Amino acid sequence: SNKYIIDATAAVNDKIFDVAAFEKYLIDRIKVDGKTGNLGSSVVVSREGSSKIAVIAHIDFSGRYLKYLTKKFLKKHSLRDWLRVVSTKKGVYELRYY
Amino acid sequence: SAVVWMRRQRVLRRLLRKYRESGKIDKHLYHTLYLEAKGNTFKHKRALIEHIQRA
Amino acid sequence: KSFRTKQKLAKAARQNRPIPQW
Amino acid sequence: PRQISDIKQFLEIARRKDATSARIKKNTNKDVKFKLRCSKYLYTLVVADAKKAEKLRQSLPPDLTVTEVG
């Protein structure tokens, strides 16, 4: 039902984060009902092109949850100083530098 | 105890009035049940339901 | 504060005025 | 402020000399609000279709100093 989009055009251009890395992180950290990989048919993650990550969910999926998941990878990469998560529009999150 | 008694009395009175309007209990039975319920005869709604079924 | 006390306070504050230098 | 729902009386109260200024509001709901300032009361009118809204723009007298969104 609802669609959530995470833009990674800047990350791909600056090589800070790759589409494969984002897809692997999303798959391994999607805590759908507390279980990784439990997205099922209600929620499906389908990233079209190597510039965005799209999730179509029939249930609630918090944008803060996506931001928190994105921040965990950013903290792991230790790139929080040069990369921050911003919300360009409702259901859309993008990464911005300083 | 006053808060519990106030809620219990209102619930019993509302249930008895609803039963009287539904035709389950006649006017005489409803009046007798209402008088009895004032002395906390039925401490639970199930007790009143059992009494109505036994009636 | 009436007009009277306003003028009385003004003249009270006009009494403790520094002397002209001429 | 009297909410006015009759276009014709909105027209006649505009022609009457008591009217001074008029404002047109375009909200997000694609509704047009006609606010007319009178001596004591601000009369408003909400219309929902643009073609009637535009037709009532040109139906307003030219002497009235109408203004667009604020």
């Binding site: - | - | 007009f3 306003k6 003028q7 306070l9 003004a10 | -």
Partner: protein, 70 residues
């Protein structure tokens, strides 16, 4: 000066027995201008000060220049 430039209101030191009615007629007869609102206060020294809000037809800045205190 701020009120003259922004609020279009002149400021005078008026006679302590002058009310809003006489202040209006004094300004009209002395400066040939039209006040539309007058607000009077009494300063701590017991002297009346009156703010004379002029019309939109005239402006405070030119009238102040004509008086000579601009």
């Amino acid at each position: 000066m701020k009120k003259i430039e922004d609020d279009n209101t002149l400021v005078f030191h008026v006679h302590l027995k002058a009310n809003k009615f006489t202040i209006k007629e004094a300004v009209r007869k002395l400066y040939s201008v039209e006040p539309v609102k007058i607000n009077t206060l009494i300063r701590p020294n017991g002297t009346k000060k009156a703010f004379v809000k002029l019309s939109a037809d005239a402006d405070a800045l030119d009238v102040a220049n004509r008086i000579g205190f601009l």
